[PDB]
Amino acid sequence: GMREIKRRIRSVKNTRQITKAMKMVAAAKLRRAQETAENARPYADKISHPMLEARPVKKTGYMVITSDRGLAGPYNANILRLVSKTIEERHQSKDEYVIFAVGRKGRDFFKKRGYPVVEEVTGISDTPSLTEIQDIAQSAIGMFADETFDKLTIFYNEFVSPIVQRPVEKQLLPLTSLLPKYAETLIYSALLDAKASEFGARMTAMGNATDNATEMLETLTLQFNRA
């Protein structure tokens, strides 16, 4: 009782080292996103369709957003949780939905349990700039634009506080209340919101993480001395 409960101690120490230094970044990084978000607003604001008018009703397409390279507590395992609960009733058909998996953590989920996935956008980025999803966005529209999509949809990880963020699913292509660049930017709107939320969700799990280490450490330490 004098050796590899100190390993447990040193290791738990190290973990403590990094979760807090990444807690630093979760807020370093995913607050910047807020800037690179409320900037869209400007152009996000300047505002029978090509067909982006309410029509019915066969093959629908999903676009579920998740972190790739994630360490953000549940906020990634409870949006997959939600596409995999809501499609549970929308699948008595073998149309097989089809998802546009953005982010590698949702990606892998979808290729372990068949879904399947017609697109898997490589490596998110944290900016995320202009040339990044103007593919999957553009081509997720392109599949409504003639015409294998009667409806599009993202699974957005909406950002309330940095302490919370809610699994939300919006609908994109069949609009509501030549120019569908709107759709493309809508996907910005979420892809951008989906970011904050992740690291929003990431520092929250990192503080909790740090703390949990301290605590747990302070448990372990009793064993360091009293046999």
Binding site: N14, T15, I18, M22, R69, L71
Partner: protein, 165 residues
């Protein structure tokens, strides 16, 4: 305060099966590379630094997330170095073989190779030289500075390509 350096043997390491359980960090030779052939004195020089860096980033053990920065460039290739340091009991390795082996990993020839695969890739790299590239080996046994590099890198790559990772 009497000797000229000390080799420290970490107890932790030894019951992690790591052998020899040497703690290269705090361990030293005050005499230094003065007693060290040119070849080894060279390939080692970098290696001191190599796992010195891997000592710090060690903490980020089973959490490969930092992507591209001081990441799997340092860390991932540090894990590789620590493998060639390991060494079976009663299996002294001739300098020459040590030197190639070190140079192999230290020049990234293991980087495309796995990590559970480093130990064998070394054992089999050497056996390959002893029977083929002895020219290079004996060159180090005679005023051993190793050279003919690039011919060295070529000779390695003609065993490299993995073909069994």
């Amino acid at each position: 305060s009497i000797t000229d350096g000390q080799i420290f043997l970490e107890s932790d390491l030894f019951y992690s099966g790591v052998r020899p359980a040497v703690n290269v960090g705090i361990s030293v030779s005050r005499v230094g590379g003065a007693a060290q052939i040119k070849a080894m004195k060279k390939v080692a020089g970098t290696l001191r630094l190599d796992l010195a860096q891997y000592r710090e980033l060690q903490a980020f053990a089973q959490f490969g997330s930092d992507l591209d920065k001081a990441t799997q460039a340092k860390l991932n290739r540090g894990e590789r170095t620590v493998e060639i340091l390991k060494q079976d009991e009663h299996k002294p390795m001739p300098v020459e073989e040590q030197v190639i082996s070190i140079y192999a990993v230290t020049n990234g020839f293991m980087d495309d190779i796995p990590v559970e695969d480093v130990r064998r890739f070394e054992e089999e790299l050497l056996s390959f030289m002893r029977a083929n590239k002895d020219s290079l080996l004996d060159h180090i046994r005679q005023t051993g500075e190793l050279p003919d590099t690039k011919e060295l890198d070529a000779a390695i790559e003609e065993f490299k390509k993995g073909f069994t990772p």
